[PDB]
Design a protein around this motif. Structure first.
Motif, PDB file in Angstrom:
ATOM      1  N   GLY A  88      -1.882 -14.132   6.052  1.00  0.00           N
ATOM      2  CA  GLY A  88      -3.478 -14.043   6.656  1.00  0.00           C
ATOM      3  C   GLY A  88      -4.351 -13.087   5.327  1.00  0.00           C
ATOM      4  N   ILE A  89      -4.460 -13.106   4.241  1.00  0.00           N
ATOM      5  CA  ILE A  89      -4.875 -12.055   3.040  1.00  0.00           C
ATOM      6  C   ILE A  89      -6.233 -13.512   3.362  1.00  0.00           C
ATOM      7  CG2 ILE A  89      -4.485 -11.775   0.497  1.00  0.00           C
ATOM      8  CD1 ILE A  89      -2.847 -10.504   2.470  1.00  0.00           C
ATOM      9  N   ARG A  90      -7.167 -12.773   3.104  1.00  0.00           N
ATOM     10  CA  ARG A  90      -8.598 -13.274   2.857  1.00  0.00           C
ATOM     11  C   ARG A  90      -9.920 -13.217   2.100  1.00  0.00           C
ATOM     12  NH1 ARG A  90      -7.456 -11.770   7.459  1.00  0.00           N
ATOM     13  NH2 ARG A  90      -9.293 -10.992   8.121  1.00  0.00           N
ATOM     14  N   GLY A  91      -9.520 -11.513   1.915  1.00  0.00           N
ATOM     15  CA  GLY A  91     -10.325 -10.976   1.231  1.00  0.00           C
ATOM     16  C   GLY A  91      -9.495 -10.397  -0.085  1.00  0.00           C
ATOM     17  N   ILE A  92      -9.594  -9.395  -1.001  1.00  0.00           N
ATOM     18  CA  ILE A  92      -8.858  -8.408  -2.098  1.00  0.00           C
ATOM     19  C   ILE A  92      -9.832  -7.939  -1.974  1.00  0.00           C
ATOM     20  CG2 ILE A  92      -6.097 -10.346  -1.672  1.00  0.00           C
ATOM     21  CD1 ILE A  92      -8.324 -11.428  -4.391  1.00  0.00           C
ATOM     22  N   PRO A  93      -9.236  -6.442  -2.519  1.00  0.00           N
ATOM     23  CA  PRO A  93      -7.846  -6.089  -2.918  1.00  0.00           C
ATOM     24  C   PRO A  93      -7.394  -5.767  -1.302  1.00  0.00           C
ATOM     25  CG  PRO A  93      -8.957  -4.789  -3.702  1.00  0.00           C
ATOM     26  CD  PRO A  93     -10.179  -5.461  -3.259  1.00  0.00           C
ATOM     27  N   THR A  94      -5.875  -6.974  -1.282  1.00  0.00           N
ATOM     28  CA  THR A  94      -5.143  -6.149   0.228  1.00  0.00           C
ATOM     29  C   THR A  94      -3.889  -5.612  -0.586  1.00  0.00           C
ATOM     30  OG1 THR A  94      -6.553  -7.618   1.837  1.00  0.00           O
ATOM     31  CG2 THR A  94      -4.165  -6.738   2.373  1.00  0.00           C
ATOM     32  N   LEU A  95      -3.797  -4.417   0.035  1.00  0.00           N
ATOM     33  CA  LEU A  95      -1.809  -3.898  -0.200  1.00  0.00           C
ATOM     34  C   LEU A  95      -1.981  -3.949   1.251  1.00  0.00           C
ATOM     35  CD1 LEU A  95      -3.245  -0.661  -1.742  1.00  0.00           C
ATOM     36  CD2 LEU A  95      -2.154  -2.898  -2.836  1.00  0.00           C
ATOM     37  N   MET A  96       0.029  -4.674   1.264  1.00  0.00           N
ATOM     38  CA  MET A  96       1.038  -4.650   2.245  1.00  0.00           C
ATOM     39  C   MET A  96       1.973  -3.704   2.070  1.00  0.00           C
ATOM     40  SD  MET A  96       0.275  -7.935   4.525  1.00  0.00           S
ATOM     41  CE  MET A  96      -1.136  -8.419   5.241  1.00  0.00           C
ATOM     42  N   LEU A  97       2.434  -2.956   2.801  1.00  0.00           N
ATOM     43  CA  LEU A  97       3.723  -2.926   2.563  1.00  0.00           C
ATOM     44  C   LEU A  97       4.845  -2.704   3.637  1.00  0.00           C
ATOM     45  CD1 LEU A  97       5.377   0.167   1.455  1.00  0.00           C
ATOM     46  CD2 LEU A  97       4.231   1.516   3.289  1.00  0.00           C
ATOM     47  N   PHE A  98       5.852  -3.332   3.065  1.00  0.00           N
ATOM     48  CA  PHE A  98       6.894  -4.018   3.825  1.00  0.00           C
ATOM     49  C   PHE A  98       7.514  -3.178   4.093  1.00  0.00           C
ATOM     50  CE2 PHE A  98       5.808  -8.708   4.198  1.00  0.00           C
ATOM     51  CZ  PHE A  98       4.932  -8.777   3.370  1.00  0.00           C
ATOM     52  N   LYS A  99       8.474  -3.075   5.021  1.00  0.00           N
ATOM     53  CA  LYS A  99       9.626  -1.966   5.729  1.00  0.00           C
ATOM     54  C   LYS A  99      10.640  -2.898   6.273  1.00  0.00           C
ATOM     55  CE  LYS A  99      10.072   2.149   6.935  1.00  0.00           C
ATOM     56  NZ  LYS A  99       9.843   2.587   7.761  1.00  0.00           N
ATOM     57  N   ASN A 100      11.979  -3.449   5.998  1.00  0.00           N
ATOM     58  CA  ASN A 100      12.845  -4.172   6.822  1.00  0.00           C
ATOM     59  C   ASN A 100      12.273  -5.269   7.339  1.00  0.00           C
ATOM     60  OD1 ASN A 100      15.034  -4.590   9.187  1.00  0.00           O
ATOM     61  ND2 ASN A 100      14.472  -3.397  10.308  1.00  0.00           N
ATOM     62  N   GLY A 101      11.529  -6.130   6.493  1.00  0.00           N
ATOM     63  CA  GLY A 101      11.737  -7.262   6.617  1.00  0.00           C
ATOM     64  C   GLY A 101      10.010  -7.786   6.880  1.00  0.00           C
ATOM     65  N   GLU A 102       9.548  -6.864   7.405  1.00  0.00           N
ATOM     66  CA  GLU A 102       8.417  -6.245   8.103  1.00  0.00           C
ATOM     67  C   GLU A 102       7.266  -5.485   8.013  1.00  0.00           C
ATOM     68  OE1 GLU A 102       9.434  -6.140  12.419  1.00  0.00           O
ATOM     69  OE2 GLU A 102      10.083  -7.867  12.359  1.00  0.00           O
ATOM     70  N   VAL A 103       5.987  -6.217   7.733  1.00  0.00           N
ATOM     71  CA  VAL A 103       4.965  -5.415   7.664  1.00  0.00           C
ATOM     72  C   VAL A 103       4.294  -4.407   8.395  1.00  0.00           C
ATOM     73  CG1 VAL A 103       2.512  -5.585   7.178  1.00  0.00           C
ATOM     74  CG2 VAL A 103       3.767  -7.676   6.752  1.00  0.00           C
ATOM     75  N   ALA A 104       4.659  -3.277   7.416  1.00  0.00           N
ATOM     76  CA  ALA A 104       5.172  -1.841   8.120  1.00  0.00           C
ATOM     77  C   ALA A 104       2.852  -1.393   8.025  1.00  0.00           C
ATOM     78  CB  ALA A 104       5.140  -0.453   7.571  1.00  0.00           C
ATOM     79  N   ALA A 105       2.488  -1.481   7.211  1.00  0.00           N
ATOM     80  CA  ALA A 105       0.864  -0.943   7.398  1.00  0.00           C
ATOM     81  C   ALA A 105       0.876  -2.226   5.687  1.00  0.00           C
ATOM     82  CB  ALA A 105       0.852  -0.151   6.681  1.00  0.00           C
ATOM     83  N   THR A 106      -0.968  -2.189   6.276  1.00  0.00           N
ATOM     84  CA  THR A 106      -2.256  -3.356   5.621  1.00  0.00           C
ATOM     85  C   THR A 106      -3.876  -2.143   5.101  1.00  0.00           C
ATOM     86  OG1 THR A 106      -1.229  -5.005   6.693  1.00  0.00           O
ATOM     87  CG2 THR A 106      -3.132  -5.297   5.847  1.00  0.00           C
ATOM     88  N   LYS A 107      -3.631  -2.305   4.092  1.00  0.00           N
ATOM     89  CA  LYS A 107      -5.024  -1.550   3.359  1.00  0.00           C
ATOM     90  C   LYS A 107      -6.069  -2.708   2.563  1.00  0.00           C
ATOM     91  CE  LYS A 107      -5.195   1.558   4.433  1.00  0.00           C
ATOM     92  NZ  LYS A 107      -6.698   2.947   5.577  1.00  0.00           N
TER      93      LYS A 107
END
Length: 105
Positions: free
Chosen positions: A69-88
Motif C-alpha cells: 500500500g505504498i501511496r506517497g513517499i517517503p515511506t519507511l517500513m520496518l520489517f521483523k519476522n517477515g511482517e511489518v512492525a511499523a510504518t512512517k
C-alpha cells in the motif's frame, strides 16, 4: 549496509532476513526522499548490529508498492519476522528516525 531490492528479490532480502529490515521506499521525483538518504546512510552504519537497510524504488517495483500500500513517499517500513512492525510516512530527522527505530526494533 544498504542493499537495493526489487520485486523479484524482496521475499529473500526482506521477508527472510535474519535481522530486522528498514525498507526505504523512494523515487527520483521525491525531494524529501533525497533529503533523508544521507541520514539512512548514517543509520545503516550506526545500527549495523541491529538492522539491515533496504531501498526499493517504487517506480521500478510496482508489485511491492502495491502489496504494501505504498501511496506517497517517503515511506519507511520496518520489517521483523517477515511482517511489518511499523510504518512512517513522510520525512523525519535523524533524531526522529532513531526514536522510531529504538521503539520499534
Amino acid at each position: 549496509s544498504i542493499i537495493h531490492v526489487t520485486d523479484d528479490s524482496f521475499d529473500q532480502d526482506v521477508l527472510k532476513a535474519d535481522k530486522p529490515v528498514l525498507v526505504d521506499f523512494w523515487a527520483e521525483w521525491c525531494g524529501p526522499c533525497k533529503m533523508i538518504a544521507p541520514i539512512l546512510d548514517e543509520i545503516a552504519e550506526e545500527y549495523e548490529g541491529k538492522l539491515k537497510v533496504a531501498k526499493v524504488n517504487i517506480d521500478e517495483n510496482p508489485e511491492t508498492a502495491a502489496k504494501y500500500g505504498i501511496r506517497g513517499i517517503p515511506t519507511l517500513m520496518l520489517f521483523k519476522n517477515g511482517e511489518v512492525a511499523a510504518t512512517k510516512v513522510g520525512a523525519l530527522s535523524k533524531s526522529q528516525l532513531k526514536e522510531f527505530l529504538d521503539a520499534n526494533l
